């Protein structure tokens, strides 16, 4: 008590507790002292003492240096031993890690990080839901041709898209056609929402590989286009037409359109082509019309779940499955937050008139974002959208990892002409279960795949004997 | 081939004759006299407009603007809604003292902390105090008042505290500004000399918003609840695991909340619909109204609506939305017995004369868009003294020394030695020496 009064008045007493005079003990090398600041540096919260609004008293403290260990459980260890943490695991000072777009190394207490290249993705989903290269989700409900994205230099390329009314009212829109202008705008390719891809107003056959770009159709419900410049396109034809565009990281700030500028800032995304930035989502979009005759639209300040009451219960009862941890989507909760997808699921299910189709289209966007960060949702079509899972042809079965180069015999004949990389796996009917797709019908085993020219039966000889897939020419 | 002054940059891929192009206003016009558009408004050639620090001009259907760097702004409001310096909205509900901003980013000159506490029973939390460390001085905004602590002996970095409208404004001569509505809202403004040298819940202010989720140890994360949890102050404070959903935990309060907050989407704010997106404010209004379930829930709603009305004013749309039945404001309480001078100014666009600005002292920001009651001092004593909220003559206002008001004539306190001071009868603070040893 005398010492406590000594310290409280303003004085600073010295140590009197000896090993034989009422000693005190603390775990580790925590030395007991009198008149020492309680504001301690703890290996994570450094520079506490600069903001110390308190006077001092007795207790167990640390030596002059050797900030107290907080992340670990040791005593007053030196500064250059602080162990790093990252969502649990305790990383030693020298162990490296590679995050999403950067790699980091645990220096003394603090990570040192360095950027890694990683591309960008614009998405046009649902009837009207546009995600730019920098997030910035917004809803448009347009009616015209629009310039989705085009290289700014003079000619490089251009990618358009037809947004138009789709049901009864103006508030139910759809994507109807995708037009690509490439090769110095000397080649026009058209994708309609019934397949029937056509080049220069002429039907074409798939696959079609050229010097500048190439197109493929791996599963009859997905058309995947690659461009030598660094553009990659995925077009989904069911249950509702959608578009995904991926760009390399060497074109940062050289793109303009409804997909933004791709420069890292998501506040100038609405920056019109004539200077200043807009405020709403429709104001900015109207300035990118490809036909002067189209009219101007305005935002819609309503929720479809309030105008169609009979649909609200249906929309909720199913779209709420995204937050149920026991459900298969519950696995993805670790990686990607489902809130935005849930809200958009309710919006689409309430709004459109083919409620099940919109439900399945919205629910199949979560199972693509999640399937891009490792976690792959296996067998999520068992209750919700199994309307066509069992309808696969004779030997075909619904697969979730149907990539491009699981193709027929001729794909193995070349095996290096069309295996474009950087394309996410997609689902659909197939059976490359070591039974390589035949020239037609059931997917035959490797033994008699074919000999691809023309595809012959498994009984021919050139002297290059016909055999399982490969040829000993 | 039919250009329209809006498809100029499009390309015309897929009436007026050749040459002239449609302008959208009427008859066909040449390219030179082609007008400009902005926020659904059509401006002819040679116009002028301002954007928050600059001025622009419609030249050839294209805007040409000056290039000066505006200040940086972070916003904290509601039951845990944050807007960083680079424009990235998010939510976070913690119960501890968190670093709002600071300069000790891996040696520093300031720090701004916040104190979040639970308000409701659904688990949400809201700010209720602020602390400002400048050099060694520590201001604290608390209980509707400003309290000085540990005032440094002789450095006393120049600051200035005053009250504008319904808000309390604290400025620092170094370039820091704090605006506080006295209940939960906070705006932090920084000068462009701090660019890319801060860190905290408000991001690092570098005109790049893909790295504002930088944790305390210089790691970039993708989760709100991990970014937030790493900036707590006391290590013993718990960690947040999930964001509560108020309207789902209080079903019976939803019907009211969705009906009162619907005014934002009504015709009353029809002018502002084309300039500020109302959805992220409607969501906040509904989120706040479902949570204030322990009393005084008519105050959570008025502030939420005011947050949007203020932005509408800031963008150039002065809207009058209060009525005797909806968030009434009681201004004439400040008037003398029955002389009528204080008036409710819906959008604060008034510049009058105080006894600070009368002596050349000027601020560095325009705060001419804050709601509240304002004076209209008469013509027989037209100088508004602030520390007493009084209209007085140009002679008898005060001295304003060391951020402390002293009435004219009153012997000015002085923390010096042998130096007495007095406010003259001319609003002039003057000091004399006393040889009682010491000299002049
Ligand atoms: C507005 O900003 C200016 C710019 O610094 C401030 O002027 C500074 O004032 C302090 C003390 O009054 C001086 O030490 C600095 O040298 C001044 N700056 C310059 C560049 O000369 C001014 O104080 C700010 N406004 C207010 C009300 O403080
Ligand atoms: C798809 O995944 C399944 C997992 O059961 C497995 O057959 C294989 O990894 C993939 N199938 C292929 C590549 O044909
Ligand atoms: Ca951008
Ligand atoms: Ca930043």
TrEMBL record, chain A:
Residues 120-295 form the VWFD domain. It is found in: Secreted. This is Mucin 2, oligomeric mucus/gel-forming. The lineage of its organism: Eukaryota, Metazoa, Chordata, Craniata, Vertebrata. The gene is MUC2. The chain holds residues 270 to 749 of 2817 of the full protein.
């Amino acid at each position: 008590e005398f010492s406590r009064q000594c310290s409280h008045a303003g004085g600073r007493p010295g140590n009197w507790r000896t090993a034989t005079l009422c000693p005190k003990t603390c775990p580790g090398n925590l030395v007991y002292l009198e008149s020492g600041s309680p504001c301690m540096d703890t290996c994570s919260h450094l520079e506490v003492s600069s903001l110390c609004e308190e006077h001092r008293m007795d207790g167990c403290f640390c030596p002059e240096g050797t900030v107290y260990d907080d992340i670990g459980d040791s005593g007053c260890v030196p500064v250059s031993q602080c162990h790093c943490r990252l969502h649990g695991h305790l990383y030693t000072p020298g162990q490296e890690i590679t995050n999403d777009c950067e790699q980091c190394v645990c220096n003394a207490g603090r990570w040192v990080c360095k950027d890694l290249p990683c591309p960008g993705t614009c998405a046009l989903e649902g009837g009207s839901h546009i995600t730019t290269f920098d997030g910035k989700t917004y809803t448009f409900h347009g009616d015209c041709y629009y310039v989705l994205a085009k290289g700014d230099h003079n000619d490089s390329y251009a990618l358009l898209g037809e947004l138009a009314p789709c049901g009864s009212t103006d508030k139910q829109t759809c994507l109807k056609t995708v037009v690509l202008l490439a090769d110095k705008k000397k080649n026009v390719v058209v994708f309609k929402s019934d397949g029937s891809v056509l080049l220069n107003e002429l039907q074409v056959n798939l696959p079609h590989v050229t010097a500048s770009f190439s197109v493929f159709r791996p599963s009859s419900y997905h058309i995947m286009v690659s461009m030598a410049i660094g553009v990659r396109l995925q077009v989904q034809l069911a249950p509702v037409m959608q578009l995904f565009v991926t760009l390399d990281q060497a074109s940062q700030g050289q793109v303009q359109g409804l997909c933004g500028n791709f420069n890292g800032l998501e506040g100038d995304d609405f920056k019109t082509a004539s200077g200043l930035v807009e405020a709403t989502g429709a104001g900015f979009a109207n300035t990118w019309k490809a036909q002067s005759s189209c009219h101007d639209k305005l935002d819609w300040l309503d929720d479809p779940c309030s105008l169609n009451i009979e649909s609200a219960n249906y929309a909720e009862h199913w779209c709420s499955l995204l937050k149920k941890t026991e459900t298969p989507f519950g696995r993805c909760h670790s990686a990607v937050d489902p809130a935005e997808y849930y809200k958009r699921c309710k919006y689409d299910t309430c709004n459109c008139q083919n409620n099940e189709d919109c439900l399945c289209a919205a629910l199949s966007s979560y199972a693509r974002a999640c399937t891009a960060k490792g976690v792959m949702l296996w067998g999520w079509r068992e209750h919700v959208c199994n309307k066509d899972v069992g309808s696969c042809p004779n030997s075909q079965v619904f697969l979730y990892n149907l990539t491009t180069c699981q193709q027929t015999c001729r794909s193995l004949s070349e095996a290096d002409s069309h295996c474009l990389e950087g394309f996410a796996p997609v689902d659909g009917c197939g059976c490359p279960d070591h039974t390589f797709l035949d020239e037609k019908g059931r997917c035959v085993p490797l033994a008699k795949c074919s000999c691809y020219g023309l595809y012959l039966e498994a009984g021919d000889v050139v002297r290059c004997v016909c055999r399982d897939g490969r040829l000993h020419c | 081939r039919a250009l329209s002054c809006q498809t100029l940059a499009a390309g015309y891929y897929h009436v007026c004759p050749d040459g002239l192009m449609d302008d959208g206003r009427g008859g066909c016009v040449v390219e030179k006299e082609c007008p400009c558009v902005h926020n659904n408004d059509l401006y002819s050639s040679g116009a002028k407009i301002k954007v928050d620090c600059n001025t622009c001009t419609c030249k050839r259907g294209r805007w040409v603007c000056t290039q000066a760097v505006c200040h940086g702004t972070c916003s904290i409001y509601g039951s845990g809604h944050y807007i960083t310096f680079d424009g990235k909205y998010y939510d976070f509900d913690g119960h501890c003292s968190y670093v709002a901003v600071q300069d000790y980013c891996g040696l520093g000159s300031f720090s701004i902390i916040t104190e979040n506490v639970p308000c409701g029973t659904t688990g949400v939390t809201c700010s209720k105090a602020i602390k400002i460390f400048m050099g060694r001085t520590e201001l604290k905004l608390e209980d509707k008042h400003r309290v000085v602590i540990q005032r440094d002996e002789g450095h006393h970095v120049a600051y200035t505290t005053r009250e504008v409208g319904q808000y309390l404004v604290v400025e620092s001569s170094t370039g820091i500004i704090v605006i506080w509505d006295k209940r939960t809202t906070v705006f932090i403004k920084l000068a462009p000399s701090y660019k890319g040298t801060v860190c905290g819940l408000c991001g690092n202010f570098d005109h790049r918003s893909n790295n504002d989720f930088t944790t305390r140890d210089h790691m970039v994360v993708s989760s709100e609840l991990d970014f937030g949890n790493s900036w707590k102050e006391a290590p013993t404070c718990p960690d947040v695991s999930t964001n509560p959903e108020p309207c789902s935990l209080n079903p019976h309060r939803r019907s009211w909340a969705e009906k009162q907050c619907s005014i934002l989407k009504s015709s009353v704010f029809s002018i502002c619909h084309s300039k500020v997106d109302p959805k992220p404010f409607y969501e906040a209004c509904v989120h706040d109204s479902c949570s204030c379930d322990t009393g005084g829930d008519c105050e959570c709603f008025c502030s939420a609506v005011a947050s949007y009305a203020q932005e509408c004013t800031k963008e150039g749309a002065c809207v009058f939305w209060r009525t005797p039945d909806l968030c009434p404001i009681f201004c004439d309480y400040y008037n003398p017995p029955h002389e009528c001078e204080w008036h409710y100014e819906p959008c604060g666009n008034r510049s009058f004369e105080t006894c600070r600005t009368i002596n050349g002292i000027h601020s560095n920001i325009s705060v001419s868009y804050l709601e509240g009651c304002y004076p209209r001092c008469p013509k027989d004593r037209p100088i508004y003294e602030e520390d007493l909220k009084k209209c007085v003559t140009a002679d008898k206002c005060g001295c304003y020394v060391e951020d402390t008001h002293y009435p004219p004539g009153a012997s000015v306190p002085t923390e010096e030695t042998c130096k007495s001071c007095v406010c003259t009868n001319s609003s002039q603070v003057v000091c004399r020496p006393e040889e009682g040893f010491c000299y002049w």
